[PDB]
Structure formats: structure tokens, C-alpha cells
Amino acid sequence: LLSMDMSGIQDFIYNISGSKALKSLRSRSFYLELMLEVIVDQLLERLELARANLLYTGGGHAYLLVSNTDKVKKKITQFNNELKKWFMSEFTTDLSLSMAFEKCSGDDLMNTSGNYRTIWRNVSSKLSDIKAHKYSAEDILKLNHFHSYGDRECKECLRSDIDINDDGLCSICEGIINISNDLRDKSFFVLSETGKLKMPFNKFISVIDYEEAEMLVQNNNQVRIYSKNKPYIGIGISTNLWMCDYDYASQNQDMREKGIGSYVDREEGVKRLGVVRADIDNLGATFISGIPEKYNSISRTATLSRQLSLFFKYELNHLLENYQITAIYSGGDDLFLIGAWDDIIEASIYINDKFKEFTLDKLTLSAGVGMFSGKYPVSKMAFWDEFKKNILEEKLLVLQQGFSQTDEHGKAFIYKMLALLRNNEAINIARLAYLLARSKMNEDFTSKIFNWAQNDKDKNQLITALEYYI
Amino acid sequence: YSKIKISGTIEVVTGLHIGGGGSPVVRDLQTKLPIIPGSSIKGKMRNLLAKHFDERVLRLFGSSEKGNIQRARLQISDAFFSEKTKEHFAQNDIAYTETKFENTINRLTAVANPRQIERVTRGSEFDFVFIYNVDEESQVEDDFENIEKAIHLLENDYLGGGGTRGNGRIQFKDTNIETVVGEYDSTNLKIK
Amino acid sequence: YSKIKISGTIEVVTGLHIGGGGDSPVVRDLQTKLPIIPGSSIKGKMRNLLAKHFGLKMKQESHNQDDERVLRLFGSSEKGNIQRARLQISDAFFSEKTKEHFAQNDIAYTETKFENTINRLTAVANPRQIERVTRGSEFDFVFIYNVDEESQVEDDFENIEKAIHLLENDYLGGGGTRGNGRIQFKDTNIETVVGEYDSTNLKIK
Amino acid sequence: MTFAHEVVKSNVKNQVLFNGLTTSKLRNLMEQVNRLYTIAFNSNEDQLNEEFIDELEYLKIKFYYEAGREKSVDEFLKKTLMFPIIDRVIKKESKKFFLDYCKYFEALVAYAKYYQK
Amino acid sequence: TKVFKLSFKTPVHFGKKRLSDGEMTITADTLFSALFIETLQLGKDTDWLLNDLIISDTFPYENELYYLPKPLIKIDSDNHKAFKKLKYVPVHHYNQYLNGELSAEDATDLNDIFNIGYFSLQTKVSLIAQETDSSADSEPYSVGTFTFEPEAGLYFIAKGSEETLDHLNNIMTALQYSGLGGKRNAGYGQFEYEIINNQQLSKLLNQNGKHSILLSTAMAKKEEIESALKEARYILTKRSGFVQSTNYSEMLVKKSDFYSFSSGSVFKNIFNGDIFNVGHNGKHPVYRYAKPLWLEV
Ligand SMILES: Nc1ncnc2c1ncn2[C@@H]1O[C@H](COP(=O)(O)OP(=O)(O)OP(=O)(O)O)[C@@H](O)[C@H]1O
Ligand SMILES: Nc1ncnc2c1ncn2[C@@H]1O[C@H](COP(=O)(O)OP(=O)(O)OP(=O)(O)O)[C@@H](O)[C@H]1O
């Protein structure tokens, strides 16, 4: 049982500060995903083995069930060595990969005495402690002695070791820009020896359409077409790669990808941006513990993993269709959406409910949403029932109806409301009583608002809702 | 070698609006008491002094970008409310920060769209410290004359935003000059 | 490089009602509980009147561009040929001598004269009470003028004199057409506070 | 403190308000309190002025005289206990508590205004 | 062997890659660099304070409690979640942790109580461009700063002969008025220091064990690294950046990239570091501090 872990995704994906940031992020998550996919496929080619042997992929992980042969082990070790060489050559700290495997027998897989979970934890532990020792002696000496003439940090990509070129961009990030430009229009990605973007095994990735992909097939070229969630392709080495690539900015009159301002410039509220991050809280046990004592088979673990992958890689794309939001990092257990402040919140709640349906209220979501001004480095942009029923549905609707029916009460009146509410003093409460007496709303609105302000939980909900209003 | 400390207090003759958030004003995200970033002080002094004349302004603040490199000789530090003002306002029950309302007139239309701005209360006192690093003996008198000129211009100008609109006028009081490292006499130096 | 300071006092000929707080109170310093004249109001009225004096066209009405002299004196920095403002207006505070007079004679700082509203076809009245600084009170103001250039000084001070002269026959505050907020200027002083430019030949009435 | 609200609800009898009290019967009343409101809001220190003490005495003068004119005014001024609170304000010499009384009376006025024929 | 207490009272920017990044502690490289530049500015000699002095990294403290970095020891459980979220272990519980006596709920409580500061971004502009004269965009930029509660700060570990310690104390007296971070001249990073002795920290620093906990950022010299990595749990950290007054062009001078072990690595074979040279095409040598400060348990 062989397991692979990608070292530095959360750092390398979040060194983005440029104006084209959104284009790169879609290109960067896809770049890491395609790295993992091509490396796993290349491994399976080394093993002369089938694609069915890949149990799970996603995030920076991968799980394989390969033959327990000395030949297999020597090939794994050799390919690990070449792999580590290559990553040291290209990024040297930002991205690294780890290999680990631990023996298992048929009796183990058939779920005899829960030893499936024991071996799962053992392989996890060996993977997680081999990361401690990543560099041999000679490698670490080799790194420290290069008085090599090089240029300075890539603007889009924070890296000293990298060397910039035209317009202060290095090769890697310029290729990232190009493939990002091609992402929205073209659906197929090819593994070719000339290509655009540098890739592990002396290979390059470029973009294709079904027709020239077809010609490549009849060109009997050693190609692997990687698709954008397209079934019924039947083109050469069909690879329906699972990925959620959604962007509302392409729904406008211009098909070309636009910058972060396309979402900032919304006039329905403050010109800001919304960001959401989500992780399944009960996932470690779910893959490890699973269904206890009766269904912890390798078959059912595979089924569970695939169903989670399909949810986090298809359903989100269809759910997002009604929101001004763009999908950035999706897959594994991580969900990253960026867009308008209101749309981000509404989509977060809606996707939370939909997920509770898909897992039948067995798995939950932990999420956090913040507000930041436009064109802030997206790198630093990134570093339930009560909120829906009480705040968004009841108090927010009451306040919206009241403010829509009575005019002249803008952000100044609500901000005086805020000054009285945040400073939790009885003098502010009496002042608020007078202010609601002076306000020209229906008496029901005033009474409800005052009585909400009189309760700490209800005053906090009220301030949250009215802050959402502005 | 020696170091010279310039310490004192500054008053807002009229309200001050640095407004990094903007319409808020800069605060500390926990104490919520407003401050004055040293970047504002440094930038306004540098602009005024340069526009008062390029070797001396290069010498005080240091550019170190034009193929020749000069280390900064005068370090500005941030400011905070004096304890005296906090005590005084707490005793007299005075809000720390005001909120003035404003408008603007559309020509051919004469319909006013409102405006809200947040302003530091008049009469507050901030505490400031300057550190000067004497690296050339024969230059301290000229440098302090220049810094006095900069203070003089700043007293007759504004800090922050909307200065032409009537805010940001400041004043300097209770300034002392104390040597803290080394053995340079700092009793013949003045800043008003 | 020099700077010219303009000082004086603004006497309320009749009730002034700035009243930026919105009953219907008046702006007050929170250090002394007193009504003030914000400098931006003064500067805006000077801007509007001086612009209306010179050319003010339809296409000029559209954009808040204005005559080159007015823009030069008050600064635009909006499109292309930007001009940093040469003239800085400051706020006005309720002076100390009027403190002494209203303390010695026990005079209120703000009247509350009631007004009404007789709508037609019903003739039903509707009452209201507003606050306005008492007559005769004085406020102290200060101006600072920058000389970015040498020769133009005379023309800029001529335009400043014109602006003051127009403003003395107009209103600050609100309800000006309804009687409130007339002022006059007096006791003006012109002195070069920083620099080496003489100012003995310069006068603003 | 809203006990004023409670008493006003207890004073809606089978309808009449304080048995013949109208808000315009209160004209001189709120005029006096508002006039004092201005003169006090001008002040700086919480230690009351002593012509302000005289003015509070004059306010109590207006209270008994209004009570003398009308029976409904007498009932209003007695039950809702203007009179001890004025006495203790006179005894205390505190400005903030004076404004507290001011918003008290204004609360009475507003609630009664919404509580009418 | 004394410790040096640091209280700040002003926001400090410490930096990893750009100015708008904020970081809580600083490594021995920048600490030794600051000491060396302060020494040179003061004009005293550097030989004494070059090859005798051992400096540990800066670590945070709270009201009365001190902190140390999390050892990278293999605790054999399986949560592996609450402990991964832990970054600093209070000194009172250090030996408890190294003996596997820390419970999950206690770890959660420690994580809850560990508030010792918060992060902020202040936006700044630069009108030095044509803006002053002609229509030109003001250029906004941001800096990442980090502030402490009034009863917090950072502390040191220093050791050496008494004469070197006296020199260090003199230099710190000088240094409390320069900065210790990023935009020193823009209003950030002034501190007051105080010398304290702690009985518990002393006992911890003079214990006796079989393992070793690295408290600084070091790299073994060429001939000893081979034996150094016999049984090691470590993580490497890339350290780069420009240099101050080495040639005409600051934007053409950039220190050579260097790699060193982090501040929590565990070793089995003690090695001695060195002040590696990271210069080339320069007029004066540029130094980087890589010398360990062990605690034996
Ligand atoms: N291509 C990607 N783009 C963006 N985020 C990704 C990508 N792949 C995975 N992630 C998310 O980023 C998270 C953080 O990755 P991180 O650098 O911590 O490595 P990891 O795979 O979690 O393993 P480890 O931290 O043990 O090395 C992952 O757990 C995953 O959810
Ligand atoms: N579809 C999937 N199939 C199999 N394994 C997955 C899948 N998605 C995520 N995982 C794995 O489950 C593990 C969960 O660990 P992680 O720390 O990322 O989340 P977590 O432990 O649930 O965090 P928290 O408990 O704080 O929410 C990851 O290491 C990841 O490899």
C-alpha cells in the first residue's frame, strides 16, 4: 500500500499578489492538480500496471495498491530518487513529494479484525515521519554552494531562486498565465514533449480541442488527453479528469477572462470581495475509521472516497451557477470560492445545506468568510442553522422591509444604531429608544428592533444583520 | 558615536484625519484609541523640506535608490494619546472621536448627496519621539536647523486629508533634546 | 518659497445655522460645547460664488470644472493639468471676547426661534423649532496662501478680494434666502508667516 | 426605566387619558423643562449652578400652579411622582441626573402622545 | 548565561517575503545581523563578538509565562490534529510534553489561552511620483505589522564568557533605539529591554538527557554534516534577502541563498556551526549566523 504526499501546496499556491491574480489561482490549483495526475499516471506506467490501481487522489495525497514484489520496490525507490531530483531542480523548497509504503496481506483487506484501520494508520504514520528526513547529506551540501548568476523574484510568484524575464516575469508564471488564458475556452489538455508548461518527466502540457485531439489520436502520438469534466469523449487515452472550473466573469458579454475588478465593481453594496474556505471536520476518521467493525473493507473505503471526490468535483460546479463567484481550489477536503460579499455568504449557506443533503446530515462543514478590499494580494486574501433562520431570514428580512418602506434612513442612521449598540451601555439603550421614537417606521418594526436590542444574543444577531445590510 | 533623542507632545489645533481605513480613522484594533503613523509625519516633513529648496534632504531621510546610497539619519516613531488627555476626557465625559456630516452640490442639479467623515477630537495630545544618529560631527547644527525649518513649515500646514478643507492643523509643545547614547552635548539644540 | 497668512473675524449679522448635526442642532466642538463654522463650508461658498462670477457654462455645469483662475486658486487635481491648491481654509471658533461678553451680560449662545408651515387647501399649521447662533457673535478664522509662483500674487489677491466682497453679500449656513446666516468681515491682517516675500501692498476688504 | 410606560398603560381608563388630561394641557410644562434643558446642556460641570437651583425651584412653582388650575393635571402630577424626584434633584445638585429626569418626562410625553383618543 | 526581556509598545514588522507580510518572532540570523550592524555603527570591534558568542532565537512570552518552540519528537499515539495546531509549549509543561504527559484537552486549553498578539495591515501611499505636479496615480501599498498586549513581548537566550556578555549588554543598550524589524525608519520597531533570571528556565537549560532540542537556526560545517544527520528530525528553511551597503546598486546586490535547520529540530550527534560567508562580488564580507544552542532532553 503506497501513499504519496505533496509538501508545500498551501504556501506555493498563496504567493500571489498581482493584478491577474484570479487567472493564476485557477491556473495554479490546476497546475498542482495536473502535476499530481501526471506523476501518478507516469508511476503507473512504470509499474506496467492499470489505472484502476489508484484508490484515491485529491489535495496533495494519493493512495495506491500495488504489487508487493522486490521488483516493485526497487522501481518505486528509483522513481522516488529521480522525482526528488527533479523537484529539487525546479523549486527546491516550495514543492516536495514524499513516498511511503507498508506491507499488507489479503487477510488485512478483507476486514478481519479492523486491522485495515491499523495498516491505514501505519502507512499514514510512515508517510508523515519520512517527511522529517527529506534531504541526504550530499544534497544539502549541493544546495548551499551555488554562486550562480541569477535574477530576482518573480512578481506574480514569490521566489528568490527563480529568475525573471520580460516584464519581470519568469518562465513558469508566464506559462501559467498562458494556460490560464486558454483554460476558459478550451477543454482538453495534452501531455506532449514540446508543449508550454514544464512538467515532471521531461514533458509539457498544452491545450487542445476534441478535433485536433482526434487528429493526434490518428497521429498515433504518445499522448494523454486530460479533459475538463467531459464524458463520452472516447478520444485516445480518455481521461475525464475531475475538476470544478467555474467563473461567473465569463457569463458577461465578453468571453475573455477578466480581472478581480469584474467582481469588485458590483454596485449592490460596498465594492469589496468575499472569500470562503471549508473543510470537512469529520474526515480523518471517515477515511480511517470508516464504518466500524462491519464495513471497513477496501471496497467500501474506495466507494466512500470516490463519492466524496465526485461531490467536491462536480456538484459544486452546478451549484455555483447562480452566484457571481469563481471556483479556485476545489477537491480533496478544501473548498475555495471568491466573489461578491453577499453572493459568497448565500452560496456558502446553500452549499452547506446541499452537502448536508448529499451526506444525509452525516458530515458537517467548518467555514470562515471575511471581507477585504479589491486587488489585495489574493495570497493574503486567503491566509449555521441560527445564522440562516434567525439572522438572514428573520431579522435581515425585517430590516430590509423596514428600510425599503421608510426612506431617508441610510448608512448614517444605521451607523448611529451601531454606535449605540456596540457600546453596550444603558444610556445607549435609552438613546436608542428615543431614536426609534423619532424614526418613521411602522411601530412593529421599532418595537421589534428595540426588544432585539434589549437581548444580548438578539442584539448581536441584529447588529450582524444590519451590518450585512450595508 | 552618539544618539540624540527628541521627545515631546503634539496637539491638534483642529481635528486630524489620517484615515487609513478610508470613513474611519487609524486606530489600534484592540485598544481602539487613535494614533498617528510615523509615515505621515516623515512624508509631510520630507515633502515640505524638499519643496523649501538635493543633498540635505537626501541626508536626513535617505533615498538610497539613485546609484548612490545614504542611510537614514533621522528616525520617526509612531504616536499615541497622552495619559493627560485620557484622564481629562474621562473626567469630563468627552467622546474620543467626532463625526462631521458633509455634502456636495451638483451643478445644473443642485441636489446634495450627503457625506460622513470621522475626525479626531480637537485639543487631544499625542506623544512623539524622534531619534537622530549623529554620524558626522560637523553637520549636527545644520541638520537641526533644517529640522526646525521643517517643524516650522509643518506648524503652518496640515497633516492627513482634506487639509485645504479645514482640518489637520497641528502644533508642537513640550519638546526636549536629550542625548542617550554617547557623549555629545544636546543642550544647545532647539526645536520650537 | 513663502506662505502668506490671512487672519480676521467673522461677525454674524443675523442668525447663522450651520447645523451639521442633522431638534435640528448646530455643530459643536466636543471640547467646549460651542457652535463652530467649519472651514470647508466657507471654502465651498467661496468656490461657488467665485465660479459663478466667472464663466459657468452648461458643459461647465456638467463636470465641476471651472475658470482657470478659480481652479488655480482652489485646486482641482482631477484631470490632466492638475493644480495643487494654493489657498487653505481653516475652521472658525467662537472667540474669547464674545465669551466674555455673553458671560458678563448673561446672553444665550443659541436661540430657538420657532417656525411654522401653512400648506394650502388645508391651511393646517405644522410647527418646528431650529437653533441658530445669536446675533453679533464673532468667530476667528485664519487663511494660509501658498506662492508656488512669483508674478501671479497680485492677481490671486485681487480674486480673493472679489470673492470676499461677493460673499459678504450672500449667506453661509442654511435658510439664507429666508433670512438666516448673513456675515460681514472685519479686522483683517495680512502677513508673510514663512518666507521672504513682502506683503505690505496687499489688502483684502 | 419604563415604569412611566407602565403607569401610562395603567392610566388608560374606560376612553380617557388621566381622566381628562390632554397633551396640550402640558404645553407650559414641557416648555419649561426644555428651556431648562437648554440652559443646563450649555453647562460644563455636573455641579449645578445655583441660579439653576433657583430655576428648579421656579419649575416646582410651575408644577404646583398647574396642579392648582386643573384636577387632571393634579392627578397626573401626583401619581407619577414628579414631585419627590424634583425634590431629590434639588437635594442632589447633579446635572446628569437632571438630564435623566428630562428624558423621563419626555418619555412620559411621547408615550402619552402615542396613547390618545 | 542570561536572558534578555523585550517589550515593544509599538507595532513591529518582521517580514518573510514582502512588506505586507507579518511575523511574530525573528530568527538568529537577523538578530546577529542587527547586533553586528549596531556594533559597526558604534565603531567598536567585531572580533570579540564574532567567534565567542552564542545567540538563541527570539521566543514570545505573556504576563508571567514563557514559551519555547514545539519539539519535533515522534509522539506515538491517534489524534495528530490538536498537536499539529500547537506551535509553542509553555515552560511549565515542557518536560511533561517531552514525556508524553500532555493530554488532548490540555492541548486545546493551551491553544485557547495562547493569545499574545494580533495582526494588522496598514495601507500607505507614495506621492513622490508625478502626482505632486501632473496627473499621476498615487501608489498604495501595505505593510504587515504585529502588536502585543501590554504584558507581552519576546525574550532571548544568550551564553558565553562574562566579558562577551558585558559587551552584548552594552550593544543592546545602544540597540534598543534602533529597530529590530523591517521599516525601522518608517516608525516601527522600538523596544525596551530588561535582564531577568528565571529559576525554571535555568533548570531547563542545564538539564541532562540523550536527545537535543535546537533553539537556533544553524547549519553544520562541511566535514561534520555527514555525522550530524545520523538520526535527525528537522525541517529546512530557505533564508534569502538583500544586503545593506555592499555595492553601488541595492537592486543589483542580493545575498546568496542559504539553507539552515529550523528552531525545533532534534538531533542525536551534536555539531558546532559557523558564521558562513554568503558574499560574492562585494567589497566587504557579509555574514549569516549558524551556530546552535542546545537544550539536552
Ligand atoms: N492544487 C491545489 N491548489 C490549492 N490548494 C490545494 C491544492 N491541492 C491541495 N490543496 C489544499 O491545500 C491544503 C494544504 O496543503 P499543505 O501544503 O498543507 O499539504 P498537505 O497535502 O496537506 O500535506 P502536508 O501538510 O502533510 O505536507 C491541502 O490539504 C489541500 O486541501
Ligand atoms: N475524497 C477523499 N477521499 C479520501 N480521503 C480524503 C478525501 N478528501 C480528503 N481526504 C483525506 O482526509 C484527511 C483529512 O485531514 P485534514 O487535516 O485535511 O482535515 P481534518 O483532519 O478533518 O481537519 P479538521 O478536523 O480540523 O476539520 C486528509 O489528509 C486527506 O488526505
Side-chain angles (χ1 to χ4, degrees), chain A residues 11 15-17 91-94 117 121 124-125 128-129 131-138 140-141 143-149 151-153 155 158-162 281 376-377 379-380, chain E residues 16-18 20-22 72 74 77-78 80 121 123 142 219 221-222 225-226 229-230 232-236 238 240 242 250-254 256-261 277-281:
Chain A
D11 194 6
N15 298 16
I16 305 305
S17 63
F91 309 107
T92 300
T93 300
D94 281 347
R117 146 169 196 267
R121 184 178 296 113
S124 84
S125 67
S128 297
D129 64 358
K131 81 181 37 234
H133 210 311
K134 294 181 177 67
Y135 305 96
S136 294
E138 284 188 349
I140 208 172
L141 295 174
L143 292 176
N144 289 282
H145 295 89
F146 291 167
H147 295 85
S148 302
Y149 292 165
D151 289 345
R152 293 178 179 83
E153 187 176 3
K155 183 169 71 172
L158 304 189
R159 210 182 113 205
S160 81
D161 187 9
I162 202 65
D281 196 306
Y376 267 163
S379 60
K380 299 296 183 181
Chain E
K16 183 178 179 180
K17 284 313 183 144
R18 67 179 64 252
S20 74
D21 181 65
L72 183 63
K74 183 176 179 177
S77 297
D78 187 4
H80 192 63
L121 284 179
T123 68
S142 315
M219 180 56 49
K221 183 175 174 66
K222 184 178 184 293
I225 192 66
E226 293 177 350
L229 299 174
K230 284 322 310 303
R233 298 188 187 275
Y234 73 91
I235 75 177
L236 295 175
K238 181 174 72 68
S240 66
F242 292 166
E250 294 293 328
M251 294 299 291
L252 188 147
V253 298
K254 180 179 178 181
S256 45
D257 291 331
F258 191 86
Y259 305 133
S260 64
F261 307 89
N277 199 346
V278 297
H280 76 84
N281 290 353

Side-chain angles (χ1 to χ4, degrees), chain B residues 104-181:
Chain B
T104 288
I105 301 299
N106 291 138
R107 305 241 180 100
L108 191 65
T109 313
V111 64
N113 43 27
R115 174 151 91 270
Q116 181 69 258
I117 190 167
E118 184 177 1
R119 295 176 64 186
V120 173
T121 300
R122 183 178 182 270
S124 54
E125 293 177 350
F126 299 82
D127 292 331
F128 84 99
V129 298
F130 291 12
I131 307 313
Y132 187 110
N133 313 302
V134 285
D135 63 358
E136 292 289 329
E137 294 293 328
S138 67
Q139 294 179 356
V140 69
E141 324 193 3
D142 291 331
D143 291 331
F144 263 50
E145 167 185 0
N146 302 348
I147 202 67
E148 180 35 69
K149 182 62 65 68
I151 301 299
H152 204 202
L153 297 165
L154 172 43
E155 293 179 353
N156 284 16
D157 181 65
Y158 66 81
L159 284 169
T164 66
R165 264 191 281 300
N167 46 10
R169 314 191 60 260
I170 62 170
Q171 183 62 255
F172 280 65
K173 293 179 179 179
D174 296 352
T175 52
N176 72 10
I177 302 299
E178 191 265 9
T179 177
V180 65
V181 176

